[PDB]
């Protein structure tokens, strides 16, 4: 389901962060503190990799990071479009890290004539939203990013579904209802998680 | 407010569970339903939730809204939080105009940018962008508790060091760097959300 995918990505991000610190062996307790999770749950998940995932008395950071990365398919590239050339849409098209990880934005769209024709990023010009459905099907786009206001999120999501999209990354504060998977971005949820750790420490 | 870790761990679990119940339109929940979604004994739920008396009960079950307000109150997170945004670019402007923040009690009382051509602009209705030199003074004078880092990766660790010396209580970071500060830091990374998305896409194809 959704939680096991989030944990697997959590493990991957944490192990990558552990490798940058020079750590080669990590314990389930240390992973518990970094991911805010039970240690027994971590040992239950990582037993999938057997002895290959172990080193010393803890876990082989390098082996787990490599195996999970192959499970997550980090080598594959993905074609993305962004609907909405506002503040969020411009930030996504200018996000240097996304292009490095294989998430290629080949098109960005908007409904405002003042933004159409201009450049959202180097090599990417804003296209009319009326051409979004043909653009998705012509380039075989897999992922669409919804960066339009709330009241147009569901409509854009449905046109992506009709055009053959495979998944949606949604910024708009609406519950998108489609038959493709959806990942919602909610910085308010990240803020709430931050407030919990603030009151625990500051008290 | 001395709350033990085993008790505090369940309150946040209740809190997160009750939050989804409100977004599901649920007004009344039973101890057995809470047991089903929390993987805790129903005898434990009724033991914990009796702390709120009749105020937490509604009909034959529990008042989801009253319990959500009271548990967030005990955890100390229901209060309004004063926020500042460092960086008035694309991310900073979108954060400054985000409606859902104000509804959940995250009020941005100031935004900062080191660009002289940007200083003085509006960015969002009801607020003015300021010079980053006065970030320490603004955080100290207004008691800002959460700082949002929307600066490029090059100046990100320095911004987090200034907020720590100014007395910030937390940091929301967008920049793609490892923030090395003693204050708690929460990082936003849509590539992680994309990795979750692509993994689910591939599994459905298989
Ligand atoms: N998930 C989160 O944490 C946050 C959510 N948001 C949401 O992201 C979305 C956009 O945010 P901003 O960039 O700050 O606002 P914005 O106004 O700068 O961007 C909106 C863009 O979408 C275009 N647009 C409007 N209707 C359209 C349609 N049917 N089709 C194509 N394009 C259309 C507009 O021309 C405009 O350029 C909003 O829904 C906002 O609530 C904003 C900040 C963070
Ligand atoms: N976590 C995620 O998923 C994503 C992260 N980002 C990151 O957010 C940050 C901002 O991105 P954008 O706003 O889209 O680009 P941007 O170029 O529009 O934002 C830069 C702004 O920060 C200002 N600035 C530069 N140095 C500063 C300093 N020392 N102090 C205060 N302000 C300073 C600049 O004057 C400019 O206004 C970047 O680090 C970016 O990598 C961007 C997209 C999504």
Alpha carbon of A82 to ligand 1 centroid (Å): 11
Pocket of ligand 1 (CB under 6 A): A 83-89, 109-112, 115, 129, 147-150, 152, 156, 171-173, 185-187; B 94-95, 97-98
Which of B97, B184, B195 minimises the CB distance to A72?
A: B195
Do B1-73 and B74-206 show the same overall fold? no
Interface contact A191-B1, CB threshold 8 A: no
What single string gives the DSSP state of each residue in B163-186? HHHHT-SEEEE-SSS----SS-EE
| Domain B1-73: assigned CATH number | 1.10.10.10
Say which CATH class B74-206 falls into: alpha beta
How was this entry determined? X-ray
If one residue of A130, A148, A154, A160 were mutated to test the ligand 1 pocket, choosing by the most ligand atoms within 8 A of its CB, it would be: A148
Interface contact A73-B198, CB threshold 8 A: yes
Sign, CA torsion A19/A25/A28/A29: negative
Domains of chain A, by residue range, sit at: 1-70, 71-203
Which of A20, A91, A202 minimises the CB distance to B91?
A: A91
Question: Considering only CB atoms, which chain A residues are within 8 Å of B97?
Answer: 87
Superfamily grouping for domain A71-203: NAD(P)-binding Rossmann-like Domain (3.40.50.720)
Nearest Cα residue to B85 out of B164, B158, B144, B137: B144
Which of A76, A97, A200 minimises the CB distance to B176?
A: A97
**CA-CA distance, A185 to B172, in Å (whole number)?**
14
Bridge partner residues of B202 (DSSP): none
For the purposes of burial, counting CB atoms within 10 Å of the CB of B46, is it exposed (0-12), middle (13-18) or buried (19 or more)?
Answer: middle
SS3 B86: strand
Question: Considering only CB atoms, which chain A residues are within 8 Å of B194?
Answer: 78, 98, 101, 103, 143, 169, 183
Architecture of domain A1-70: Orthogonal Bundle (1.10)
SS3 A36: coil
**Closest ligand 1 atom to B100 CA:** 41
Q: Which residue of B has its CA nearest to A187?
A: B188
- Whether residue A164 contacts residue A143, with contact meaning beta carbons closer than 8 Å, is answered with no
The reply, when asked if residue A86 is annotated as ligand binding, is yes
**Closest ligand 1 atom to B99 CA:** 41
SS3 B29: strand
SS3 A26: strand
For the purposes of burial, counting CB atoms within 10 Å of the CB of B94, is it exposed (0-12), middle (13-18) or buried (19 or more)?
Answer: buried
Q: Are strands A103-110 and A78-83 parallel, antiparallel or unpaired?
A: parallel
In A117-127, which positions are buried (b, 16+ CB within 10 angstroms) versus exposed (e)? eeebbeebebb
- Is there an atom of ligand 2 within 6 Å of B120 CB? no
Chain centroid, CA B53 distance in Å: 28
If one residue of B96, B98, B100, B106 were mutated to test the ligand 1 pocket, choosing by the most ligand atoms within 8 A of its CB, it would be: B98
Distance from CA of B84 to the nearest CA of A (A): 13
Alpha carbon of A89 to ligand 2 centroid (Å): 14
Q: Measured at the alpha carbon of residue A94, what is the angle toward residues A105 and B162, in degrees to the nearest 5? A: 145
Please report, for residues A128, B135, B145, B205, the alpha-carbon distance to residue B172 in angstroms, rounded to integers and kept in the order given.
34, 16, 11, 35
Please report, for residues A8, A58, B7, the alpha-carbon distance to residue A29 in angstroms, rounded to integers and kept in the order given.
17, 9, 20
Which of A74, A90, A202 minimises the CB distance to B169?
A: A202
Counting DSSP H helices and E strands in chain A, the numbers are: 9, 10
Please report, for residues A87, B84, B88, B173, B191, the alpha-carbon distance to residue B128 in angstroms, rounded to integers and kept in the order given.
17, 11, 10, 21, 31
């Amino acid at each position: 389901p959704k939680p096991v995918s989030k944990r697997l990505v959590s493990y991957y991000m944490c192990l990558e962060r552990l490798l940058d610190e020079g750590v080669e062996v990590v314990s389930s307790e240390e992973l518990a503190r970094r991911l805010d999770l039970k240690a027994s749950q971590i040992r239950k998940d990582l037993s999938y990799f057997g002895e290959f995932g172990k080193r010393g008395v803890g876990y082989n950071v390098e082996h787990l990071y490599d195996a999970i990365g192959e499970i997550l398919g980090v080598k594959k590239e993905w074609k993305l479009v962004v609907v909405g050339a506002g503040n969020i849409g411009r930030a996504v098209a200018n996000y240097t890290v996304m292009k490095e990880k294989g998430f290629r934005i080949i098109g960005i769209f908007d409904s405002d004539p003042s933004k159409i024709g201009k450049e959202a990023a180097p090599g990417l010009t804003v296209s009319d939203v009326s051409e979004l459905e043909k653009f998705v099907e012509e380039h075989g786009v897999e992922i669409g990013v919804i960066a339009v206001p709330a009241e147009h999120a569901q409509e854009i999501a449905e046109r992506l579904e009709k055009a053959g999209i495979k998944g949606i990354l949604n910024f708009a504060p609406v519950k998108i209802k489609v038959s493709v998977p959806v990942e919602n971005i909610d910085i308010t949820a990240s803020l709430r998680v931050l407030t919990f750790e603030i009151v625990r420490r500051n008290s």
